[PDB]
């Protein structure tokens, strides 16, 4: 509850990041989702296609947000987290089925379609997309161009396609394939319903399919939380005269720390200056002497510390940081409270803390001459004290008791 005269270090100062910026390369190559879904003619259910999708961005900005799809449900992840989840080779399967048979596409479902031409494993994690296409695949005389496996020897395994047209022996000879009666006059549930299923094997190869990576505007001369192509950090970005090679992205100093980065969108080099920080020291005389103090932000500009005693009314930029609360004076005295770089603080007269350049001593000019001598005519017997530590307190510590007392 009382503090002696001196300068004491307290909680450190550090400029907080004003905002967070994210920079990623231009989103150029997108997956052929448009071709996959908006194809003029879709495959049949018994002959469901399998198109491989790889090395592209799978952004669902125009897929999920569109209301054209009447059935959108993913069995492994949410559509909201789909855009920020990296993937691998993507297989797109498209077919047209009856409206009432859309429920059979779910894993662990029954039905002639599910048991004969399209089965999904119970551990399905992809997305199934379906929407009504009555006006697109309905014919007044019956769109018989689409066929479904009506007869088969036994149930088929998931992710299997059957093309054999051999006559099924019921005993009794029936063609395994039957055409759909798609007409514009069909009721809901019997109308044609185009279905596209997004099945992909993941976490078994280098990731070649990834979702969109949004990026924000680039700010400079401000301590921010940057993120350049996954290289996170905090600092002040500033244009630099460093000349990177065309294939180089980051810059590392002699201590293996990032000090220069290249913006993935506009290819320029930005110096990464760390956000300003430093200890906070409080200059004080004794508590009973006075209750006013001066603070020092070591190695910190107070063209900048007001960002964080921000009013000031008494500031002084020194080489050891800048001083707040102490009045700068031209006079030089003996060092009372050391601050650094030859600046000392003292409590003087009304009374206030003064900051000054300390004086090494009184100036003296010896009256030297080649024929002049000074000889003392008197003397003083001087007795001065010298204090020297000789020993300290003996301490014996039982290691076992201290670490594991009684246990």
């Amino acid at each position: 509850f009382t503090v002696e005269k001196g300068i004491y270090q307290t909680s450190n100062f550090r400029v907080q990041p004003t905002e967070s910026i994210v920079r990623f390369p231009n989103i150029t190559n997108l997956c052929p989702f448009g071709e996959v879904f908006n194809a003029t003619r879709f495959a049949s259910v018994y002959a469901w296609n399998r198109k491989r999708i790889s090395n592209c961005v799978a952004d669902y900005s125009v897929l999920y947000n569109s209301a054209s799809f009447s059935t959108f449900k993913c069995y492994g992840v949410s559509p909201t987290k789909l855009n920020d989840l990296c993937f691998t080779n993507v297989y797109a399967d498209s077919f047209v089925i009856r409206g009432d048979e859309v429920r059979q596409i779910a894993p662990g479902q029954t039905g002639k379609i599910a048991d004969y031409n399209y089965k999904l494993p119970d551990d399905f994690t992809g997305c199934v997309i379906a929407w009504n296409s009555n006006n697109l695949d309905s014919k007044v005389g019956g769109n018989y161009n689409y066929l479904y496996r009506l007869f088969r020897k036994s149930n088929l395994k998931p992710f299997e396609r059957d093309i054999s047209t051999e006559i099924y022996q019921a005993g009794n000879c029936y063609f395994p394939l039957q055409s759909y009666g798609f007409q514009p006059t069909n009721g809901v549930g019997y109308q044609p319903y185009r279905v596209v299923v997004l099945s992909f094997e993941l976490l078994h190869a280098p990731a070649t399919v990834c979702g969109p990576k949004k990026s924000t505007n680039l700010v400079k001369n401000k301590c921010v939380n940057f993120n350049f192509n996954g290289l996170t950090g905090t600092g002040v970005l500033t244009e630099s005269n460093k000349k990177f090679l065309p294939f180089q992205q980051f810059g590392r100093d002699i201590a293996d720390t990032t000090d220069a980065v290249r913006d993935p969108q506009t290819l320029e080099i930005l110096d990464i200056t760390p956000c300003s920080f430093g200890g906070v020291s409080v200059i004080t005389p004794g508590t009973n002497t006075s209750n006013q103090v001066a603070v020092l932000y070591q190695g910190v500009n107070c063209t900048e510390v007001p960002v964080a005693y921000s009013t000031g009314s008494n500031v002084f930029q020194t080489r050891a940081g800048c001083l707040i609360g102490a009045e700068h004076v031209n006079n030089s005295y003996e060092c009372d409270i050391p601050i650094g770089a030859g600046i000392c603080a003292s409590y003087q007269t009304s009374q206030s803390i003064i900051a000054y350049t300390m004086s090494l001593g009184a100036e003296n000019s010896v009256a030297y001459s080649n024929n002049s001598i000074a000889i003392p005519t008197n003397f003083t017997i001087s007795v001065t004290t010298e204090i020297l530590p000789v020993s300290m307190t003996k301490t014996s510590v039982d290691c076992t008791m201290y670490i594991c007392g009684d246990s």
Binding site: Q9, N12, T232, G235, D253, I254, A255, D256, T257, D259, P274, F277, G278, G279, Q298, G299, R319, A320, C335, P338, I339, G340, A341, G342, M358, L360, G361, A362, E363, N364, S365, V366, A367, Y368, S369, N370, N371, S372, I373, A374, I375, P376
Partner: protein
Amino acid sequence: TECSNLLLQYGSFCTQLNRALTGIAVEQDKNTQEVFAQVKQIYKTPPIKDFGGFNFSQILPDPSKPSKRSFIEDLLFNKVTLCAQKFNGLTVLPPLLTDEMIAQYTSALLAGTITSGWTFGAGAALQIPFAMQMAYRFNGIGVTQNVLYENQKLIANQFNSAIGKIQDSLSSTASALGKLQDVVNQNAQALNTLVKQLSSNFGAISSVLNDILSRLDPPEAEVQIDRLITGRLQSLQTYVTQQLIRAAEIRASANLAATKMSECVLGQSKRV
């Protein structure tokens, strides 16, 4: 924040480390003070440099240079060659006595010497002709005054030539200030190692806390962050301990330098 809360479980290790590192800095300031601040007053050499033929021009201050440093002093400062670490909470506090102030103390000591002898180190500076002071010192070493008074020209020429040879040796040989360069190199290398130890996994999945936090859930992230905390705390502890030992050596050297100043500059020593 996660790593900070995890670090809170380790107690006052950080406070101990900062206390040790602050004691080191205070001791450095005390070392400089004890070595150089041995003059009550700032003596100045007289404008007329009639010192019996002895030439102190190359050790006395040179006003032309902004820092009033002697020719030999500037030679030494140029010979000893010496921000980046700031990224990771590493600061370099400036010394209390500036280089100009240390040079002023040295100039005061040298002027008091060449104008008083050993009287300024025992009381008020009493002026004496420099030839007479050198005769006193010849008596001190066991040689009568008449030897100096009859070989004054030769002795002054020998002293001037010796000072010139000191100039040449400093301006040609660089290994002379090897001890000072070694101290600088050791401190810089210790700080560099401390910074470079921030890029070690220490057994964790990665050395980047952001990578750990992003690619792991909170408890596994806590385990890996604890591994990183242990590694970094051990690195900091090793740095602080080696700094304490090196500061002990530097304090021994500074005490020796202060004793040498008192016993060789402020007086004449009979110790061999």
